Ligand binder design. Sequence first.
Ligand SMILES: [Mg+2]
Ligand SMILES: [Mg+2]
Ligand SMILES: [Mg+2]
Ligand SMILES: [Mg+2]
Ligand SMILES: [Mg+2]
Ligand SMILES: [Mg+2]
Ligand SMILES: [Mg+2]
Ligand SMILES: [Mg+2]
Ligand SMILES: [Mg+2]
Ligand SMILES: [Mg+2]
Ligand SMILES: [Mg+2]
Ligand SMILES: [Mg+2]
Ligand SMILES: [Mg+2]
Ligand SMILES: [Mg+2]
Ligand SMILES: [Mg+2]
Ligand SMILES: [Mg+2]
Ligand SMILES: [Mg+2]
Ligand SMILES: [Mg+2]
Ligand SMILES: [Mg+2]
Ligand SMILES: [Mg+2]
Ligand SMILES: [Mg+2]
Ligand SMILES: [Mg+2]
Ligand SMILES: [Mg+2]
Ligand SMILES: [Mg+2]
Ligand SMILES: [Mg+2]
Ligand SMILES: [Mg+2]
Ligand SMILES: [Mg+2]
Ligand SMILES: [Mg+2]
Ligand SMILES: [Mg+2]
Ligand SMILES: [Mg+2]
Ligand SMILES: [Zn+2]
Lengths: 152, 48, 108, 45
Amino acid sequence: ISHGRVFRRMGLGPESRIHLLRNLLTGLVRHERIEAPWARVDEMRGYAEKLIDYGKLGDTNERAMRMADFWLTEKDLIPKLFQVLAPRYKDQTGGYTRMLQIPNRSLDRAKMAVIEYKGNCLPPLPLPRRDSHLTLLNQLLQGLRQDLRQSQ
Amino acid sequence: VARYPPIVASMTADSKAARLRRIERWQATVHAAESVDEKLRILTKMQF
Amino acid sequence: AAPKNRRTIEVNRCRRRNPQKLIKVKNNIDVCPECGHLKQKHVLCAYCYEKVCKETAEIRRQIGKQEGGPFKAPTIETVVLYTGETPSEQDQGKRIIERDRKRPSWFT
Amino acid sequence: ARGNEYQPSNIKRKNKHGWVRRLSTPAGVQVILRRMLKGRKSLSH
RNA sequence: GCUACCUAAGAACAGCUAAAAGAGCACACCCGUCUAUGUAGCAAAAUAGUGGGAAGAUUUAUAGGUAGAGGCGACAAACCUA
RNA sequence: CCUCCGCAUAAGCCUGCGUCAGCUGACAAUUAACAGCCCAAUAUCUACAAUCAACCAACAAGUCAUUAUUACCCUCACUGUCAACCCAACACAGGCAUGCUCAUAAGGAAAGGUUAAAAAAAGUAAAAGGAACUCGGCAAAUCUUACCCCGCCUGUUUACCAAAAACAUCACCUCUAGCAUCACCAGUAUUAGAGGCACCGCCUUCCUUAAAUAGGGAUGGCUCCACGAGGGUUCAGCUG
RNA sequence: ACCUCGAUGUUGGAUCAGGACAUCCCGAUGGUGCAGCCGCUAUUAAAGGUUCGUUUGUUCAACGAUUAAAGUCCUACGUGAUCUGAGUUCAGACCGGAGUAAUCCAGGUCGGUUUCUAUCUACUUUAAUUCCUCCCUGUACGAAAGGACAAGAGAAAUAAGG
Ligand SMILES: [Mg+2]
Ligand SMILES: [Mg+2]
Ligand SMILES: [Mg+2]
Ligand SMILES: [Mg+2]
Ligand SMILES: [Mg+2]
Ligand SMILES: [Mg+2]
Ligand SMILES: [Mg+2]
Ligand SMILES: [Mg+2]
Ligand SMILES: [Mg+2]
Ligand SMILES: [Mg+2]
Ligand SMILES: [Mg+2]
Ligand SMILES: [Mg+2]
Ligand SMILES: [Mg+2]
Ligand SMILES: [Mg+2]
Ligand SMILES: [Mg+2]
Ligand SMILES: [Mg+2]
Ligand SMILES: [Mg+2]
Ligand SMILES: [Mg+2]
Ligand SMILES: [Mg+2]
Ligand SMILES: [Mg+2]
Ligand SMILES: [Mg+2]
Ligand SMILES: [Mg+2]
Ligand SMILES: [Mg+2]
Ligand SMILES: [Mg+2]
Ligand SMILES: [Mg+2]
Ligand SMILES: [Mg+2]
Ligand SMILES: [Mg+2]
Ligand SMILES: [Mg+2]
Ligand SMILES: [Mg+2]
Ligand SMILES: [Mg+2]
Ligand SMILES: [Zn+2]
């Protein structure tokens, strides 16, 4: 029974899971885009968002500095986290990460995911775009909207 | 007021920079050694 | 425990040709509008994603050349500029990564 | 625990199953003769 | 070339306590009390923990010797290439 | 993140992750100072350990030496030098001597991806109780008393179901032997061999539990000082 | 001495229990040397239940404390491809005895390897019971001592389901 259990069991245990997520998150902070098994990316997305929040908390905050020091194995990223990522998302309140599925890894056919930080300089991903508003169905729904607006 | 941790390689990782940092740790022990006897012992103990 | 009798080919066929074992037909396959190669509805196009990964690899090689050494992550934003492009007003105060090819159409 | 009864050592190998020892006694000479009659490529160890 | 015993000439035994010990605690090392796993196994006898000895009748590398109505044996009818 | 290790020598194997192009073929490589490979005779020398060798201490008495003559001008040959390696039918969780490193500067990766069903293995934590489990406190947790049976003790044994009360053991006892050039022994009755036994020493119904088929007490034979992964009983604590 | 000696030791215990009723308790009745309470005996009833400890392999038994009761059996003396091996069974060794000895023992004791990845069958989600307390009531019954039913209420315990 695992009712309400929200954390995946990864690696060799709790500490190993934390370290795996830490390495993935350090790579994410360094490169602004990471490919990894879908489950691991899903687990690490929350920690990525939490790091962005801690960076927003400020460079001078001792708790935020300690959290960044722990979670960024390469210490050159801490200035990056506090001076690039957090200022970039200062306007936003959430959704700093974009996660998408990727074709299964050729090696072991694992479910792969690409996770990036929004607003990075890298080329945009082939995001899924909804159907154009000029399609037949969308135009019919536009007619519905206009008629409802006029009537009421 | 912002105390960024030093930008150095990790001591325990498996990398060229980590190996260099461990070598630096060894050389730091050599430097901290007081007696010339201890310095020579540390410098020549490992036989290769 | 060991088997008590050889299982006949009829029984074996009944077992291993069952629908529960047959490979299910996928109905979420579609054609990518951008390049026309096949993709799944919820998965990114393999061809387009390979394009993006290769361009990202080139940009990252340029970034590594610019940084020149481990632990040299900049404290300032990064902007990728291709041949025939000049930093804009907002591109000021951001490290520039130069690419020798022209601006890709999908890149913006 | 068992299986590795062979602890190789060329000194023992030659002193126990060598050409000199086989020729040392009439029985070993007959051993070599039997190997030669059978056509063994390796007459002595 | 395993193993039983022996011959020649070698090697090992941290640290502490006691002092000159077939002494005590305890590494390396040797062994294999009990438990669990394993039982076509990692293994044709092992793994983990626990445990006995660990300066001695100790452990051990090298070469040699004793051969089957025999050898060797601190006798377990033990070992002498599973 | 791990470090059992690691680097060399020895032993063993013998080209066994060097390059190239298709595991296979070709090409390349280990360069002696290190090590091995020695000595002209004839006689003749050599009692006094080692232990920091100095006090001291011994016993099991121990690893290191030349001389006197006669001969004697050619000097640097040969061989090992690689590796991810050997013995276990295997890229085997086993076996493998030595010197340094005593945790490393060297060497490595427990997780193919996902889920987190049962059963199973290992581990951590547990309300109150604390052996009521059980053949037995096996295991786990703690760091714990006292006493019996056996064996004096250290050791040895059925390699692979028994490590013990069995074998051995100092000590004691019995029997045999008056002696040299291959053991006994280069010894001689205080010696040697065969054997027994086992140090030494000495002589001649009640208690425990509430409950107890458990435990303890009212020449040989006694005698438990010490010791024991031996077999029983037990206070207290401890704990799934 | 009829099947099985061309890999099933056995006894206890653990686990799960299926079944019979010749019923230990709970239910309904007849008789009684049944005034009442205790009981004894017989008919009917197998839905439910039928304890934990000390010694000891031990089933059993004795003992301690309980219970409404601590039922008799069958199920390969149920079940060991689910577990244990405590007695018992091989190799070791003792005491006692037999034997010239090798050895032996229905005796006592210390130790002693318990494999299997499930092919087939079968199967894997099917309205509770009892004790105690109070009331009736220290009422009926009885001379007293004792002491009831039925019905009702309250408390628990177990079992099932959450
Ligand atoms: Mg996992
Ligand atoms: Mg050997
Ligand atoms: Mg010592
Ligand atoms: Mg000692
Ligand atoms: Mg011996
Ligand atoms: Mg015997
Ligand atoms: Mg015998
Ligand atoms: Mg054999
Ligand atoms: Mg791995
Ligand atoms: Mg897996
Ligand atoms: Mg508890
Ligand atoms: Mg107790
Ligand atoms: Mg019991
Ligand atoms: Mg008990
Ligand atoms: Mg124990
Ligand atoms: Mg003894
Ligand atoms: Mg002993
Ligand atoms: Mg044995
Ligand atoms: Mg042995
Ligand atoms: Mg044993
Ligand atoms: Mg008891
Ligand atoms: Mg007949
Ligand atoms: Mg009846
Ligand atoms: Mg019967
Ligand atoms: Mg038994
Ligand atoms: Mg008996
Ligand atoms: Mg027994
Ligand atoms: Mg034992
Ligand atoms: Mg079994
Ligand atoms: Mg099974
Ligand atoms: Zn596409």
